[PDB]
Amino acid sequence: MIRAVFFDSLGTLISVEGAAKSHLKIMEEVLGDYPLNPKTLLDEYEKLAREAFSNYAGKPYRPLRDILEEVMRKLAEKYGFKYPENLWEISLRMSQRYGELYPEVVEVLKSLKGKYHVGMITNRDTEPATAFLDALGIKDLFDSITTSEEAGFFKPHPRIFELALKKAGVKGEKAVYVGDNPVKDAGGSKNLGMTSILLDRKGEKREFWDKADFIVSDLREVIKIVDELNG
């Protein structure tokens, strides 16, 4: 029996497009009148951020604030602009201003309540992740929010999934994990017996579909999978 449904954050519940807009707005704020195209700065930021995602995946937790201050110090040195004071506060403000949910999220979370434990599993730090969910009005639609900061390790290390399952009070075989990252994200979930659902919104990850138990393009399909597993 499936008793718990856990969701990834960025790309699953939280819009990639809203995150990109919030990051562009951060770059615009950092640069001010400095004569660098903010879109160019953004692309270089995202490259370094991806190379940090890769380096820390599955590793012991390190605060995201520290990782992103390191990235931005490299960029300021490279391009000659002043390193921005209070960067974390700028980033929190912009993220809450321009962040968005995918359009089906509220419907989906509400459909599961009272039937399954509903959880989010994220690599983000606890306070910002929880504050963001509160700003978007859905914090109370979750039974659990489990973070790398709580577990001590980033996805796909099993410990973060182990903690989410302990909060729900069930073995992995009784849970689904839904996320958009085939690589460097769901591996620990399969270690523990969870059923993996790969969310591929644009049909762009076909070469990795064999890594997952089920593939969906819309979160409204998740409850149909869970019902079928339970029927």
Residues near Ca ion (CB under 5 A) are 8, 10-11, 180-181
- Cβ 155 to Ca ion, closest distance in Å? 9
Our CB check for Ca ion shows the closer of 181 and 196 to be 181
- Cβ 104 to Ca ion, closest distance in Å? 16
Interstrand relation of 144-147 and 175-179 (parallel, antiparallel or unpaired) = unpaired
Which residues is the chain interrupted after (C–N above 2.5 Å)?
none
Query: Phi-psi category of 71—alpha, beta or left, where left has phi over 0 and alpha has psi -120 to 50?
Result: alpha
Measured from each CB, the residue nearest to Ca ion is: 11
Alpha carbon of residue 116 to chain centroid: 21
Contact 105, 13 (CB under 8 A): yes
- Cβ 70 to Ca ion, closest distance in Å? 22
Our CB check for Ca ion shows the closer of 10 and 101 to be 10
User: Of the candidates 186, 147, 184, which has an alpha carbon nearest to the alpha carbon of residue 167?
Assistant: 147
Our CB check for Ca ion shows the closer of 8 and 149 to be 8
Our CB check for Ca ion shows the closer of 30 and 45 to be 45
Our CB check for Ca ion shows the closer of 11 and 58 to be 11
- Cβ 110 to Ca ion, closest distance in Å? 22
Our CB check for Ca ion shows the closer of 31 and 215 to be 215
Contact 226, 176 (CB under 8 A): yes
- Cβ 200 to Ca ion, closest distance in Å? 12
Contact 177, 186 (CB under 8 A): yes
Contact 99, 91 (CB under 8 A): no
CA distance readout (Å), 77 to 49, 82, 192, 206: 16, 8, 44, 39
How far is Cα 68 from Cα 70, in angstroms, rounded to an integer?
A: 5
- Cβ 199 to Ca ion, closest distance in Å? 8
